[PDB]
């Protein structure tokens, strides 16, 4: 039978929790990691196709119908929340330092396309594509090139590299003016490289936009043709990998084990333990996602529409690419928020041979989400089936000093994992009392 005392109890096996669990176990703590659901991943789990029907459709089709049309569930691993990995991002820097690269294989994403006047254009990957792209005239490209030289050459501690600009005092629009960049170029650099979901960054200081733009460029440099990576067999592999890191170093894992009751300490309100069908387990603190403590969570105001579309064919005007990101900036549609599309396919063992997965997502701003995404649906051509779903974005009410209930944030509508790792670094400090400094294993 089982130890009941742990240094840390972690609830739910989403990527945020799993990364925390792994790092804590590596640190020497004794983690117990429980999940009410019968599988790894939480809200960002990759699920089979039948499960996709069970989750999002009103009248699921027969096994027999599904299988002739789409094939057997073991070929399908479909992300519930679309994300990519910045090549030089922080999640990959964690993957490397923790050696979880051993439990996950990556392909490069084929490219990034940006939307204009109803047509998608490829973001240039090298000089040949730069030269032949019709997004910028000859001389705009030069200024653009002089701008990008500045992003690399800029060194914080050498004023002579700044070209007369201060990232704290100048706005990004003021930086853009300095280099002579017209508004189309601003949109390009802002929505396609810095990856902002609206134009508010223009009036805000430059610093954060600079950093994000430097990250893009650094991510394209590392392996080449694009800034993104994607795990074979779906995003679900990421949490599983960290779960193993945790297990290797001492962690205990229970799935399909609902939390019958949370236990708080007498008078104090702080966390004591939890009560499961496998007995009762105690720890001085708990790390959990918002579905385990709804009352200690508040909405952030945002709701996100997520549309999963199965195609029989490559996306139009993408040179038959195997993977793809489409950015539809808001200015092009009269919105407050960009629309995103992520495409992956049988090349990543996420669906049966011949199919393509296209996951459209955006922040809802009307009372009819299905209509908001229509411009994106037109880009895909013939769609075989749509799985629609809305999710509300929660965050913790307090930081967990009062109660030792340290909650994670819901996964947001950004295209990559940079913000998720920001949540991890944060939650780590709140729990440990120390910054997350990275050790090589």
């Amino acid at each position: 039978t089982i130890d009941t005392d742990y240094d840390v109890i972690v609830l739910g096996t989403g990527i945020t929790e799993c990364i925390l669990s792994g790092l804590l176990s590596v640190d020497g703590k004794k983690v117990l990691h429980i999940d009410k659901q019968d599988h790894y991943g939480g809200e960002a789990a990759s699920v089979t196709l039948s499960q996709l029907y069970e989750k999002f459709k009103q009248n699921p089709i027969s096994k027999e119908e599904r299988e002739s049309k789409f094939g057997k569930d073991r070929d399908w691993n479909v992300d519930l929340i679309p994300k990519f990995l910045m090549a030089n991002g922080e999640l990959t820097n964690i993957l490397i330092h923790t050696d979880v690269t051993r439990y996950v294989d990556f392909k490069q994403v084929s490219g990034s396309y940006v939307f204009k006047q109803g047509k998608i254009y490829k973001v240039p990957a090298n000089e040949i594509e730069a030269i032949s792209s019709p997004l910028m005239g000859i001389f705009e490209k030069r200024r653009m090139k002089k701008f990008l030289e500045w992003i690399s050459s800029y060194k914080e501690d050498d004023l002579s590299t700044h070209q007369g600009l201060d990232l704290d005092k100048n706005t990004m629009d003021e930086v853009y003016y300095k280099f002579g960049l017209g508004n189309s170029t601003k949109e390009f650099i802002g929505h396609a490289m810095a990856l902002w979901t609206n134009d508010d960054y223009l009036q805000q200081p430059a610093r954060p936009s600079f950093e994000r733009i430097l990250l893009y460029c650094q991510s394209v440099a590392r392996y080449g043709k694009s800034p993104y990576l994607y795990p074979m067999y779906g995003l679900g592999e990421l949490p599983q990998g960290f779960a193993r890191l945790s297990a290797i170093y001492g962690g205990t894992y229970m799935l399909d084990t609902p939390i019958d009751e949370v236990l708080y300490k007498k008078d104090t309100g702080k966390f004591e333990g939890v009560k499961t069908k496998l007995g009762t387990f105690k720890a001085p603190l708990v790390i959990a996602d918002p579905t385990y403590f709804p009352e200690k969570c508040k909405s952030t105001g945002q709701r996100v529409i997520r549309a999963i579309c199965i195609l029989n064919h490559p996306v139009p005007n993408t040179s038959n690419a195997d993977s793809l990101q489409i950015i539809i900036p808001q200015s092009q549609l009269g919105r407050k928020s960009d629309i995103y599309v992520a495409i992956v396919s049988d090349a990543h063992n996420v669906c049966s041979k011949g199919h393509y997965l296209a996951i459209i997502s955006t922040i809802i701003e009307t009372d009819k989400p299905h209509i908001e995404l229509e411009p994106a649906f037109k880009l895909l051509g013939p769609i075989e089936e749509k799985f629609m779903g809305i999710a509300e974005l929660f965050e913790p009410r307090e930081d967990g000093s009062k109660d030792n209930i340290y909650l994670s944030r819901s996964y947001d509508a950004s295209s990559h994992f940079e913000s998720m790792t920001d949540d991890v670094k944060d939650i780590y400090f709140r729990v440990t009392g120390h910054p997350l400094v990275l050790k090589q294993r």
């Binding site: 990998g241 297990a247 894992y253 799935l255 084990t257």
Partner: protein
């Protein structure tokens, strides 16, 4: 390169067998050994130098929470029970079923009765072969503590796997 797995109930001695084979060590300490991800060891098969890549379950079998990446691309799978614990024997049929789903029927299996040194035995060597024969896979009775037929486990499995690789090579009839 060969990906080898060791599967079975907690407590049967999977991590000891692995550590004995690679390092030539046994830790009696009643604890689980933690800290093991995979070991590497070169084996010699009929002149051919074959590297075995041996992956530990890291205790995830304890509540049936084994990661998919563990199973993927496994060429050999050692199923292990404790000869002193009848339940670990009964459950082998269940492990067999599971492994054959996840390894996708391409892996070569092998049954191992561990802790053959103990006098508190409750499963005979003959019982173990009955089940091994029933499932279509070879049988070895081992002790990680005393080094009883531990090497034979890994050589037997490596040899069967190379047999299948070698008989699937296209013949150069041309030259």
């Amino acid at each position: 390169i060969m990906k080898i797995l060791l599967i079975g109930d907690s407590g049967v001695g999977k991590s000891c067998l692995l550590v004995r084979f690679v390092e030539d060590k046994f830790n009696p300490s009643f604890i689980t050994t933690i800290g093991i991800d995979f070991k590497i060891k070169t084996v010699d098969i009929n002149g051919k130098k074959v590297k075995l890549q041996l992956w530990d379950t890291a205790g995830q079998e304890r509540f049936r929470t084994i990661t998919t990446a563990y199973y993927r691309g496994a060429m050999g799978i050692i199923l292990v029970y404790d000869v002193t614990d009848e339940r670990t024997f009964t459950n082998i049929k269940q492990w067999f079923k599971t492994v054959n789903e996840h390894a996708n029927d391409e892996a070569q299996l092998l049954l191992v009765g561990n802790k053959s040194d103990m006098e508190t035995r409750v499963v005979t060597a003959d019982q173990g072969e009955a089940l091994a024969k029933e499932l279509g896979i070879p049988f070895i009775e081992s002790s990680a503590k005393n080094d009883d037929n531990v090497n034979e486990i890994f050589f037997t499995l490596a040899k069967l796997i190379q047999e299948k690789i070698d008989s699937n090579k296209l013949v150069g009839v041309g030259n």
